[PDB]
Amino acid sequence: MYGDLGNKLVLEAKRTKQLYARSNQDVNLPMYHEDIIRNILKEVSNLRKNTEYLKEQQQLGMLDDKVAKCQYFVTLLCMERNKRCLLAYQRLRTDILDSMAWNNNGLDLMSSITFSQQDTNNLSHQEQEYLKEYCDLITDLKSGDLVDIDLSGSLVPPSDAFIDVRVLKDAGEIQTEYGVFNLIKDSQFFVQQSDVERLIQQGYLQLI
Amino acid sequence: VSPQQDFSDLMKSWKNERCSPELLPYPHQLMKRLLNRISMQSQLIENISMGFLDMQNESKLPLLCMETELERLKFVIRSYIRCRLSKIDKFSLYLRQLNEDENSLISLTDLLSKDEIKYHDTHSLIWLKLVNDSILKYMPEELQAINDTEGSVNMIDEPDWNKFVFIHVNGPPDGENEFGKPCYTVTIPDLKEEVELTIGSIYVMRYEVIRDLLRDDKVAL
Amino acid sequence: LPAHLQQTFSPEEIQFIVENEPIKIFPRITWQLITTDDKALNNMVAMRSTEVVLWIALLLKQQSKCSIVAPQWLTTKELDRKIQYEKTHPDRFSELPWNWLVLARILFNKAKDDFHDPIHELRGKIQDLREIRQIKVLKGLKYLNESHLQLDNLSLLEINELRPFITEIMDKLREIHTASL
Amino acid sequence: YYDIDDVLADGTEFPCKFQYDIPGLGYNPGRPITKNTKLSLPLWLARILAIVGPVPFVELLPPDMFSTKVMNAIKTDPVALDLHSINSHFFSLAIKWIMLFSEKELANVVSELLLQRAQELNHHASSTSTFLLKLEEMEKEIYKKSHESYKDTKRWMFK
Amino acid sequence: DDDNTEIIKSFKNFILEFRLDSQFIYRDQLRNNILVKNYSLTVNMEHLIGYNEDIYKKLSDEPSDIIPLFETAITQVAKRISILSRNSLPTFQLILNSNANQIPLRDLDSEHVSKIVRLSGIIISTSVLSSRATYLSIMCRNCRHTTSITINNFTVSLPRSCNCGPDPYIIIHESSKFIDQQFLKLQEIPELVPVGEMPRNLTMTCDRYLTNKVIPGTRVTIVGIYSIYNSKNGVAIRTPYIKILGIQSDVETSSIWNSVTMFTEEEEEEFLQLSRNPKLYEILTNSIAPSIFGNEDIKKAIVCLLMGGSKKILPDGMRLRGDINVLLLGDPGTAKSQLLKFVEKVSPIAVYTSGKGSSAAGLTASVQRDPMLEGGAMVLADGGVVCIDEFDKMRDEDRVAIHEAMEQQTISIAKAGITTVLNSRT
């Protein structure tokens, strides 16, 4: 009853791992809960308020009682508990997030971060600032190499090395890089793994 | 110094990396001569591909071969570093505590890449900055610092040296460490008596007992 | 962020690895190329065997410009001595190329017409040697203790399939026991 | 720690009675809590109250889950025993309580139970039925990981 | 019996060498079946007839003399797979489901007797399990001959030879291995071909791993042999039954019925996606009566009914209940009597009984004795929804039972030597 709201919150955190697990991974997190954590923050503010109040009270009334220690001990733990929840949730949220910023940006010619992450505005803007700052953070890693990378792509090794891509209602032709593949619905291109990696992440290509 | 050897060591590093529970030294001496080498052949193949059209009013094979090869090896390191950056993402705090302490070897220019160090500090920074305007406002006075309380704990974890890793024992015999009956190495676990180790057979154990064998590359993972 | 798997290798990645092993070939052909790690070759002579890395043999086999040799250990008459030697030492896993599963998948997709008596035989043999060996692993897995195991000679694929399991419940098992002293 | 299983593991209630009186009850209008009151506490706070004192603040009365009836029943047929009903956390939990009370006796017991489940879980690692329903959450997670390695290695086996 | 060796060699060669490109479907069907401890195999006839036409030529000729040589043939294979040496391993049941040509129930008349017949009908009720025997030891009353009889399938008298006589052989039940049996009884589907007459029902014996595979009332398609048993009731007049190998329910039908407390992940996913709807309540209230027009208060009330409520076990033994009750009372054209059919459909476990109880079914918990709990609305419906009509027209004695039940959820029966208090959470 004392610290249990955090147990319920992480209990809810678990569900998103369930949705990232088997899964299938489309992202589409329901929302970031600002309300329930606001409840948590009001509860914890309550706590630390009574804490400094009693911290004033030992200075006068309690007179360093053996019992007093407990309040600064036990209730202190509760602060930690909320923290233990609040970060555990939060890191989970960054884990479901940064990976998404990894596997797709997105990808050639990134060329900008847009239309991605169906959560969009529904997810908190505090995370989105972190996010845009994070893909800005990875742009520098993109700028050190000189591989070339394409780090974002090709998690799965090339074979061999030409494939066949079947158009999937995409228009097209937007293939400007390397060559004008001239995208055309209902058209399969007997194209090398090279531009396939880049174009498959977008949603144009279908069968590898 | 041979290319093939740098590659075998690249693969070796890659496997040892994805296996072990924790981070390994950043091998710049090699990885940089490969980061120069690929910049060379990627320019070279585009040059020979462009010069090829001049004899055209034959065989695309060595070009296709070459290019496929380059796709393979440009995959390898990209897995490597895309992995290490993850372990940095998990160990950022631990590494920080490892940096503030004197002993023994901190990040420097060695333990992490000159590229990786940026990733580390910036990620760390923007992470602290995220959690700062998110849940610490509203900031507990004892919890101001991110570090051990202790308990529980936090992180600290996870330099976990006891985790199990499949290991396959390989290395040149002098006939150093071979005590018989078959061969090297010791072993001497702290909790248990030696097995000890046989070289033609893979033996799963803790990462800590074998870390020195790992350093010597006397056992593959 | 590797996502999957991540601690264990991917089934594909172990083929990505094994294709780095060299094996002999029979080139139909009679530039350069230096490539990087190959070291080979002077122009390959037709009707002459030579040693090259795998992924290139496979590559040149798709174009059917080269005929891969069968490994001396891949034969049914050869496998017979191996299952015979395996039934009779229920404890040890015998002697394995260590890639044999993955070469058994790879060389059968394309090269199949090159083998002498490939049909309905060897696949029957290795699907078997990949049976009794697997159950022998599950019955050798009861003896689990920390920290030791002899997995002796065992395929890379066989390692990779059961890895998360063993190296997880070893990390629940050894975890109480180290910590209870 | 950050993983959800641990922070959820600390959420579980234990029957721990107070060694001492503590006015300023945070649970209601006592105001103090009379000595030797039996109050259920989650593990997170109760964990260091048994250490800090040279007499500790709490007795640590053994949880109903660890009742010697249970630790006996798990020595018969673990494979048919239902863990998911009792807590459901066991290994995530029991691992803490074995260190907290420093009990040796049951190590040898649970160290056995977890082999006996697993010699069964390599059996459902091959490609459920009812059984998957009675695993402990964390154990269950390991089942995902194994089943996925196998499934993926089979899907690689052919085309 | 070198011929049986010749047949079984062909069955082994059919299991070990069969290739669908390139996995061996059967051989792995086997392993993946022994590990879960299923001890069964499902052959797909099309693969069979693809492999050899011959063995299917004989298997559609004299099935009941062959199929057990196929059982022993496959269990002799699991000996070389599941274990290795140099126990005990029951001889697996094979379940073969295949397309062929559907032979409707009315069209079964002789002539195909002992020839495998695929067909389709709605199961009426499932008979209570009883064991047949598989392997039983036998000792003589006099010379004490110890005989282990392997009884096979598919009645069989005991051997009289080691005065002695006439039949001095006792069944040792301490060592005898037993299997199970079911007895489905299936009424052919109402669409075809009832005409003007009541549809016939052929009695079927499921066994081993097909037993309890099917909830009564679900459409199925049985395969099995067709055969006849005696059962004195002349002359001679032997009566027809269908042995089943093996049963396959219609699409899907697993999950439902057969819906356990567990489910797949993506269902949690899409549920938790539905919990995020602002109109969620309001869209649900539109789901119930697509056909029924208006009556919105009722329409919502059903919703709040199905979802249960606060349930409290708090000490003392008193427990408060959920969830509520609903009265639709009013003149006809209210569609309430149809609406109930709907709730009956939606609710996870539901029993529509308009009575008085009907027809054979009593309305309440009732003690009846086994000639060698009788059932009712409440008991069979426990832990969920019960639908009642003509609620004013119900009998007195059980009316008492109801009005005592609905509040405390428990019916209490003091009749004769059983005083039990049994639960209705309905």
Curated annotation (Swiss-Prot), chain A:
The lineage of its organism: Eukaryota, Fungi, Dikarya, Ascomycota, Saccharomycotina. Belongs to the GINS1/PSF1 family. It comes from Saccharomyces cerevisiae (strain ATCC 204508 / S288c). The gene is PSF1. One of its GO terms (cellular component) is DNA replication preinitiation complex. One of its GO terms (biological process) is DNA-templated DNA replication. Transmembrane segments: none annotated. Its main location: nucleus. Keywords: Cell cycle, DNA replication, Nucleus. It holds the Pfam family PSF1_C. Required for DNA replication. Functions as part of the GINS complex which plays an essential role in the initiation of DNA replication by binding to DNA replication origins and facilitating the assembly of the DNA replication machinery. Required for the chromatin binding of CDC45. The keyword Cell cycle applies. Present with 1431 molecules/cell in log phase SD medium. Component of the GINS complex which is a heterotetramer of SLD5, PSF1, PSF2 and PSF3. Interacts with PSF2. The keyword Cell membrane does not apply. It comes from the Eukaryota. This is DNA replication complex GINS protein PSF1. It is found in: Nucleus.
Curated annotation (Swiss-Prot), chain B:
It comes from the Eukaryota. It is found in: Nucleus. Keywords: DNA replication, Nucleus. GO terms for cellular component: CMG complex; DNA replication preinitiation complex; GINS complex; nuclear replication fork; nucleus. Changing S13P: Defective in DNA replication. Its main location: nucleus. GO terms for biological process: DNA-templated DNA replication; double-strand break repair via break-induced replication. Belongs to the GINS4/SLD5 family. Component of the GINS complex which is a heterotetramer composed of SLD5, PSF1, PSF2 and PSF3. Interacts with PSF2. Required for DNA replication. Functions as part of the GINS complex which plays an essential role in the initiation of DNA replication by binding to DNA replication origins and facilitating the assembly of the DNA replication machinery. This is DNA replication complex GINS protein SLD5. The chain holds residues 54 to 293 of 294 of the full protein.
Swiss-Prot record, chain C:
It is found in: Nucleus. It comes from the Eukaryota. GO terms for cellular component: CMG complex; DNA replication preinitiation complex; GINS complex; nuclear replication fork; nucleus. CDD domains: GINS_A_psf2, GINS_B_Psf2. Its main location: nucleus. The keyword Nucleus applies. Keywords: DNA replication, Nucleus. Component of the GINS complex which is a heterotetramer of SLD5, PSF1, PSF2 and PSF3. Interacts with PSF1 and SLD5. This is DNA replication complex GINS protein PSF2. It comes from Saccharomyces cerevisiae (strain ATCC 204508 / S288c) (Baker's yeast). The lineage of its organism: Eukaryota, Fungi, Dikarya, Ascomycota, Saccharomycotina.
UniProtKB/Swiss-Prot annotation, chain E:
It is an enzyme of class 3 (hydrolase). The keyword Nucleus applies. GO terms for biological process: DNA replication initiation; double-strand break repair via break-induced replication; heterochromatin formation; nuclear DNA replication; pre-replicative complex assembly involved in nuclear cell cycle DNA replication; premeiotic DNA replication; regulation of DNA-templated DNA replication initiation; subtelomeric heterochromatin formation. Residues 280-426 form the MCM domain. It comes from the Eukaryota. It catalyses: ATP + H2O = ADP + phosphate + H(+). ATP binds at G330, D331, P332, G333, T334, A335, K336, S337. Keywords: ATP-binding, Cell cycle, DNA replication, DNA-binding, Helicase, Hydrolase, Nucleotide-binding, Nucleus. It is found in: Nucleus. One of its GO terms (molecular function) is helicase activity. GO terms for cellular component: chromosome, telomeric region; CMG complex; cytoplasm; DNA replication preinitiation complex; MCM complex; nuclear pre-replicative complex; nuclear replication fork; nucleoplasm. Its EC number is 3.6.4.12. Its main location: nucleus. Belongs to the MCM family. Component of the MCM2-7 complex. The complex forms a toroidal hexameric ring with the proposed subunit order MCM2-MCM6-MCM4-MCM7-MCM3-MCM5; loaded onto DNA, forms a head-head double hexamer. Interacts with CSM1. This is Minichromosome maintenance protein 5. It comes from Saccharomyces cerevisiae (strain ATCC 204508 / S288c).
